[PDB]
Automatic annotation (TrEMBL), chains A, B:
GO MF term list: adenosylhomocysteine nucleosidase activity; methylthioadenosine nucleosidase activity
EC number: 3.2.2.16, 3.2.2.9
Domain annotation Nucleoside phosphorylase: ranges: 3-244
InterPro entries recorded: Nucleoside_phosphorylase_d (IPR000845), Nucleoside_phosphorylase_sf (IPR035994)
Stated name of the protein: MTA/SAH nucleosidase
Keywords: Glycosidase, Hydrolase
Annotated source species: Aeromonas hydrophila subsp. hydrophila (strain ATCC 7966 / DSM 30187 / BCRC 13018 / CCUG 14551 / JCM 1027 / KCTC 2358 / NCIMB 9240 / NCTC 8049)
Broadest EC class assigned to this enzyme: hydrolase
Gene Ontology cellular-component terms listed: cytosol
CDD domains membership: NP_MTAN-like (cd17877)
Binding site for S-adenosyl-L-homocysteine: 126, 172, 191, 193-194, 213, 217
GO biological process per UniProt: L-methionine salvage from S-adenosylmethionine; nucleoside metabolic process
Name of encoding gene: mtnN-1
Residues annotated as binding adenine: 172, 191, 217
Length: 248, 248
């Protein structure tokens, strides 16, 4: 009875999921729409989160309060950070983190601006549990959920399914030198704008979480946005959810 | 009666507020704690949001769902961006925005990294209203709430009270050239890590919102963190809330 929550930011990242639901009921609260239905006879809630960290955290929190899901799959599109990956490849998030969180040391105006000196600002991922502070430098994908997606790699026929680190920021980077620096510094597979924020809320509520992201683009190979990748990602995630459901 | 919601991120930014409440009870869900009580006999909820955009959005959303407040005051400490301002001055947020949101045009690796080319990525503040996309390049503080705070300026005993733009980011900037660039580009009064995120959720729920921030520090004048500013801000906010309550 507790539903599986499946998230996407954009319309193109959720409409295939929504079409797969049986006996759909729609709910909109604030800026956030949910479709409550079934897959393989089991309750599933699809959430259109809108874009970015604030939207992701709001949409996830609202879903926790309204639906009490048993697990969360956050999915959608991303941009490549690892040169080994191409448009259409899918990253299963071994961990996600707030890549956009920056703290910098004091420098006078004369020294200019140097982002290579900025440090990851981990307080942005700090939480409390029963009122006690718990530090986080990243959020691990639930390792069984991660393993399951990797084991199903053969069922995805539009690229490779690989484990990787998902870097979350309110950013779309197209300065290739910046992408390279972020990859070298944080070992990122891909960048996007929601995962670690949804993951933060899932950790606060102690609900298993996994991020699943297709590269819709990568400037490391001159590969521009292809909307079909979002559809292919949802097809894989439907299969994945159905497998989980067969298991329940 | 629908409560006034008053927010602060850190313990030092809420303990004075909490001490002011009568007939309290303390509620924690996930990572977020709320104190429900009364000020001047009127219901008030004090929220400890924890730090950063994801936490602010989660804490605000959770408060909307649990308490349905009639208005939101987000307050706490900030770092100066405007050279005219000093530690202890209070900024009333005429608007707040996601200063950390960055989009850049394509540049090849050989051109390196140039943050002066990172433009504000407005999609991070885009919402939906009854299913329809609504752009936001910032969130205006409720203008009557803003005006009221400005009208009470001479009731603040420890510095100026000024209107200004609040720049929200998962960042603590201490590169003075970077502070200067953000101020020149966005006309920011001060920087902090929650306001526009809480504001985004308040806009989605159509609940009046105002940000009230004291400068606890500014590297434009070599003024390091002073925790007493946080206490002073809360005293001003209590006075302000009591004024609204008298009005109800
Ligand atoms: N290269 C990239 N960098 C950052 N986010 C990316 C990305 N590629 C895809 N994304 C994801 O896709 C969305 C991009 S922002 C949305 C842009 C789109 N034109 C619109 O108006 O809706 C975000 O949800 C983000 O998580
Ligand atoms: N100069 C500044 N830049 C960004 N945020 C600032 C700031 N000065 C104060 N803040 C605010 O104060 C908090 C700083 S991060 C918290 C740091 C503190 N040492 C701790 O561990 O709890 C954030 O909530 C932020 O909104």
């Amino acid at each position: 009875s507790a539903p599986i929550l499946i998230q996407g930011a954009m319309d193109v990242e959720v409409e295939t999921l929504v079409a797969a639901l049986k006996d759909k009921q729609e709910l909109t609260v604030g800026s956030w729409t949910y479709w409550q239905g079934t897959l393989s006879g089991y309750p599933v809630v699809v959430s259109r989160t809108e874009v970015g960290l604030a939207n992701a955290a709001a949409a996830t929190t609202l879903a926790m309060e309204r639906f009490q899901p048993r697990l969360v799959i956050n999915q959608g599109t991303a941009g490549g950070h690892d040169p080994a990956l191409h448009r259409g490849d899918i990253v299963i998030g071994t961990k996600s983190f707030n890549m956009g969180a920056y703290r910098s040391d004091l420098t006078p105006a004369e020294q200019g601006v140097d982002p290579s000196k900025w440090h990851n600002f981990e307080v942005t991922m700090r939480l409390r549990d029963n009122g006690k502070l718990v530090e986080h430098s990243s959020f691990a994908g639930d390792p069984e959920l991660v393993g399951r997606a990797l084991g199903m790699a053969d069922r995805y026929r539009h690229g490779r399914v690989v484990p990787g680190i998902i870097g979350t920021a309110d950013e779309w980077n197209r300065q290739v030198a910046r992408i390279n620096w972020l990859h070298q510094t944080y070992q990122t597979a891909a960048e996007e704008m929601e995962t670690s924020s949804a993951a933060l809320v899932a950790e606060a509520y102690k609900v298993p979480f996994v991020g699943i992201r297709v590269l819709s683009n990568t400037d490391l190979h001159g590969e521009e946005f292809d909307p079909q990748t979002a559809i292919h990602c949802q097809q894989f995630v439907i299969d994945y959810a159905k497998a989980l459901i067969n298991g329940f």
